[PDB]
Amino acid sequence: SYATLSSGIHTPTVIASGIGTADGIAFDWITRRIYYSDYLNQMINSMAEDGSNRTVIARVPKPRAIVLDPCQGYLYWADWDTHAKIERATLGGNFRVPIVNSSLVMPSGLTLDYEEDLLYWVDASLQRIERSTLTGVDREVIVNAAVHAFGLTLYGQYIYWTDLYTQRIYRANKYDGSGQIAMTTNLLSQPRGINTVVKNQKQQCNNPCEQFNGGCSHICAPGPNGAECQCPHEGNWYLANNRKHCIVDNGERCGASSFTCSNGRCISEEWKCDNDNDCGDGSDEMESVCALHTCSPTAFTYSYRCDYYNDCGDGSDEAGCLF
């Protein structure tokens, strides 16, 4: 659920209420998509800004914490299963590689040092706050003494976390942790999760998904090095083209210059974008498919050129200057 701040008495907007136990939310502004984690169903899902486009990016046995790096297009998360892992992948979940798997019992409060490209997290059982490189080569324990530190956030040169025992919010220097002070008094209840509201410019990065859904017939996820198309989890889908268009995923998709449309039927890539409907689906000549004029040197924009024929490029279609 969400509540608008400047909305007076706001009632929590009920979205994705079907999930069971779950304690993870992250919203990517770049693509305006939520990354609600369905721990009960053991799957990390992505949702639209209103929650319409539901897609399961990845499935994790015990997913609790979620970190987004839209500029780098990588989805960071942690698994509460045995031998707890900081599993990292793209926004499309291309490479689910556990960043850190040793010396971790119950990871929580994953945070990302965007300015310094570092990974910070806490562990309630370990009662320590550690930092690591995005790959995980380095590993430094920023805070050694803590009491059930559960939440975490980072901003400026300070790192903020919450304690379930003392029921208060602390602060420490992100580099070392020298200034461990208490930011609040003994709160009546236990503070679960702490986040930073970056009213100022956040991690802005041009969204590849902006241009015609990033060349995707379906949901788009702006991962590293260009957009990464996504497909609905409810249906069985296979990405077409260079992993771009979700199909019925029944197989028998023609390759080479006979790209298969979104329906599954394939037509020649030369036949594609012929100002007609080669497939039962317009995918053959779909907009995204025919996004820009990058005509091959071979073809004019001369087989039927200027020869009273409307089978060549439209510029030379029946425009025969020789006649």
Partner 1 sequence: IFSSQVAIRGIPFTLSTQEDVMVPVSGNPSFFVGIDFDAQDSTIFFSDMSKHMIFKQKIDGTGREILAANRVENVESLAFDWISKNLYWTDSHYKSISVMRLADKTRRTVVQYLNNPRSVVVHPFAGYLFFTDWFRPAKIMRAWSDGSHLLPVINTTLGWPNGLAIDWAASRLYWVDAYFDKIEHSTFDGLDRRRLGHIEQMTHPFGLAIFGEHLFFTDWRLGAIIRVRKADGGEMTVIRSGIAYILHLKSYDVNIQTGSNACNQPTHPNGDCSHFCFPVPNFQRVCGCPYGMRLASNHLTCEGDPTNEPPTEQC
The interface partner of residue 219, options being partner 1, ligand NAG, none and the CB cut-off 5 to 8 Å by kind, is ligand NAG
Helix (H, G, I), strand (E, B) or coil at 162: strand
CB of 89 to ligand NAG, least distance (A): 21
The interface partner of residue 306, options being partner 1, ligand NAG, none and the CB cut-off 5 to 8 Å by kind, is partner 1
CB of 209 to ligand NAG, least distance (A): 9
Helix (H, G, I), strand (E, B) or coil at 288: helix
Whether 104 contacts 85, CB under 8 Å: yes
Side-chain-side CA neighbours of 37 within 13 Å: the count stands at: 24
Residue (251 or 297) nearer to partner 1, CB: 297
Residue (49 or 270) nearer to partner 1, CB: 270
Measure the CA–CA gap between 213 and 24, rounded to whole angstroms: 26
Q: How many helices (H) and strands (E) does the chain have?
A: 1, 21
Give residues preceding each break in the chain, C–N over 2.5 A.
301
The continuous run of DSSP H or E covering 258 comes out as: none
213 lies in the site for ligand NAG, by CB under 6 A: yes
Measure the CA–CA gap between 198 and 237, rounded to whole angstroms: 37
What is the SS3 assignment for 189-219? CCCCCCCCCCCCCCCCCCCHHHCHHHHCCCC
Q: Which of 99, 154, 159, 219 lies at the binding interface for ligand NAG (CB under 6 A)?
A: 219
Q: Which whole-number Å values give the CA distances from 255 to 163, 223, 280, 295, in the listed order?
A: 56, 25, 18, 21
Residue (165 or 302) nearer to partner 1, CB: 302
The interface partner of residue 52, options being partner 1, ligand NAG, none and the CB cut-off 5 to 8 Å by kind, is ligand NAG
Residue (218 or 245) nearer to ligand NAG, CB: 218
Whether 70 contacts 62, CB under 8 Å: no
Binding residues vs partner 1 (CB under 8 A): 295, 297-303, 305-306, 320-322
288 lies in the site for ligand NAG, by CB under 6 A: no
Measure the CA–CA gap between 117 and 132, rounded to whole angstroms: 9
34 lies in the site for ligand NAG, by CB under 6 A: no
Q: Which residue is nearest to ligand NAG (CB)?
A: 52
The interface partner of residue 139, options being partner 1, ligand NAG, none and the CB cut-off 5 to 8 Å by kind, is none
CB of 246 to ligand NAG, least distance (A): 10
33 lies in the site for ligand NAG, by CB under 6 A: no
Residue (101 or 301) nearer to partner 1, CB: 301
Measure the CA–CA gap between 239 and 232, rounded to whole angstroms: 11
Task: Write out the binding residues for ligand NAG, residues 36-65 only, by CB under 6 A.
Answer: 48, 52-53
CB of 273 to ligand NAG, least distance (A): 21
Measure the CA–CA gap between 18 and 36, rounded to whole angstroms: 12
Residue (210 or 270) nearer to ligand NAG, CB: 210
Instruction: Tell me which amino acid residue 270 is.
Output: E
The interface partner of residue 280, options being partner 1, ligand NAG, none and the CB cut-off 5 to 8 Å by kind, is none
Binding site for ligand NAG (CB under 6 A): 48, 52-53, 213, 218-219
